[model samples]
Target: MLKMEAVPLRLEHRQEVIDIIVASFYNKADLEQWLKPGVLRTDYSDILNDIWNVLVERDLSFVVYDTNTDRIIGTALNFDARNEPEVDIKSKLLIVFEFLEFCEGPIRDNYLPKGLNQILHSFMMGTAEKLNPRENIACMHFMEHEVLRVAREKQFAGIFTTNTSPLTQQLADVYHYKTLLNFQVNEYVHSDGSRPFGDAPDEQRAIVHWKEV
Candidate 1:
């Protein structure tokens, strides 16, 4: 019988984890909405490799693997920032500026809801969707549960992610997350780069999804 296993993402699991995330996240259309198509494949992998290492070592995060084949199928980031004064997500998002330019959304919404943070940004949480038979086992819930498990273990005060991808929205719905700032997307006027999205409706509406655990 095939079994799913949850484990702390150790140093040995480093390269494998990044492979799973980049392959899963980039191949999907959700993240490609905000970032250009080649961002994941291009120079950003260096940054992402660094990002994953930071999560595993300095912050809280985890992954789930299959005992059947011992390969990673799912992952999430559970960064602790609520009590730490140095977590500046606002600045780290400079990558967003390089590829994206924001348009006006008269829609009013506030960030840092209730002045709290313990951001679960991106979580980038994913499972192998295109791989045949790989979809048979439920990998998503395992990844989600693992992150929240660590969040509780570390006494994380809150969770929030500005990412409004459909996959994440579904997770937010199931996890009882409240929207703090749905910064609905619009056609970036005076755009520096093309959005490159084709036939992806609802790609224009981004938002802030948050929940205090």
Candidate 2:
């Protein structure tokens, strides 16, 4: 039988993981899709590669591989909240980070206990592209479970994530992650008084979720 296996991410898997995330999120990510086509730049890989160098050494993230093909199908890029590196926001593709920080920062700063490795930020989770719907969902479920398993084994106090896609919010529900912030996307206005996510429908929300490990 074909099977999926999860393994801790290593430094050598850097390019593979970056490629998977870039390809998976380019035009399909909830916020990125609303931006102009090709807004996601090729050099975004370099940015992520740098991030990988820092976080992979911590052994907090993992990838899922298809045993049938012996290739990575999905990744759960978890980060130590206190140890997360401050990557300079220079890439066009990273604009979403501003919004993500806006959504996650307050609750993370206020609600969660303050300390090192106290919370595992489930930052980026994505599967390789072009899977059938069933395969895509299955990969996501497996990846999500693996993140929780790692958090427990590593003794994190909790897992923190922001879910823009309803699919992820649903999975968070299934895992019983508590919602800490629920903000409507369209209402988020930039400092210039322009709404970046205004193209999104009003009901679309960014939810901050946390689950104790």
Candidate 3:
């Protein structure tokens, strides 16, 4: 039985967590190619290790471990956007500003009644091997559920997250999460070298979505 348990993010798990995420992300073809062959891939471990050092320092990420191996196979982050840090997020913060402008207006006044900063903003969710996947079995799902649970418990007014993986965005769609912004993937990566998700030419768009709790 592949018994899995939710684990709080720990410093000791840093390298392993980065390893899992790098693996999950590069599952895409373009990302593999997009990584500069000599410059990027040559030191991918140290490069991605630094990115995750940020995630670990924030104390906002969590992992799901197959207890038997003590290895992380899933992960997610739902950090505060109120005191929003200058992390390597994919969306234009201006896009969120736009959402805020209309959230209390005709289209959104009813659903997202609270101020933007009170939302539990999420991003970067995935599993190590993927699942026959869902909130019930996927690590991304586990982390997302836990984030919402904590947000509700902590009195957050709503949830915000972006979906870049076409594979997983369908559920975000079903969750009644609304896309506040959409931009071409290549253009986004081209604009921000922080290298967010899905730069694949055939993939449709990078997106940001929101829903009130």
Candidate 4:
């Protein structure tokens, strides 16, 4: 097994973390897809800048680096959902529009309300997706362990994560994360070309699984 170590990310590692995210998750094509026509073109450097701001400004970001090769491989952000502010109306509407476009384009047909439920159940059943045969699971394990450790260390009465990925469900099942709520994301498009999204009736249901710290 590959031994892994968790290190607190300092300012020096910010660029490295951004590099990993850009290379691994946001490639050139993804940049094109995410950026609006005149909303400033994006490149690798842009990703680095944006990620840096989030990590530095938000105070809820973390990066997982491979110890042997000293490379960042994974990252997770945890916010105090209970105290977090609601999404800005404009941003929410824009995201809803973009998400709808994406969903309608490619994934609309495969949409299944039960899909997320199954994904969550898979983690409970110990079938969570693996990082791959060659990659170390240590990154994920350490990331989750550290988050919980910090939560406890800070004496937080309760720490909650608003959304849960399959990995989050696994962490909850294996590491004592409790599901607090299951909810959805709803979007409302007005006739005047305006859109809004929230937990309102007309919005699409998105599974919101939470785990308490």
- For lDDT, the strongest prediction is 2
Which 10-residue window in model 1 sums to the lowest lDDT?
A: 99-108
Ranking by TM-score: 2, 1, 3, 4
Give lDDT tens digits, candidate 3, residues 119-149: 6767456567444544334554556567767
Q: Report the lDDT of model 1 for residue 73.
A: 69
Q: Please say which candidate is ahead in lDDT: 1 or 4.
A: 1
Which candidate model has the greater lDDT, 2 or 3?
A: 2
lDDT of 1 at 120: 43
In candidate 4, clashing pairs total 3
Best by TM-score: 2
Candidate 1 clashes: the total is 1
Question: Per-residue error at 194 for model 2, in Å?
Answer: 1.3
Candidate 4: which stretches are off by over 4 Å?
A: 23-54, 57-61, 79-136, 184-213
Which residue pairs clash within candidate 4? 184-206, 186-203, 187-203
Clashes found in each candidate (C-alpha, N, C closer than 3 A): 1, 0, 1, 3
Residues 1-213 of candidate 4: C-alpha lDDT, one tens digit per residue: 565555554677665655554444332222223233433323434534544544445455556656777666666544443233233333222453354333332322243122211111111111112356445355557666666665665444443333223444455567665543343334434455543333244322323232344
Residue 104 of model 2 has an lDDT of 85
Better of 1 and 2 by lDDT: 2
TM-score of candidate 3 relative to the true fold: 0.64
| Per-candidate local distance difference test | 0.53, 0.83, 0.56, 0.42
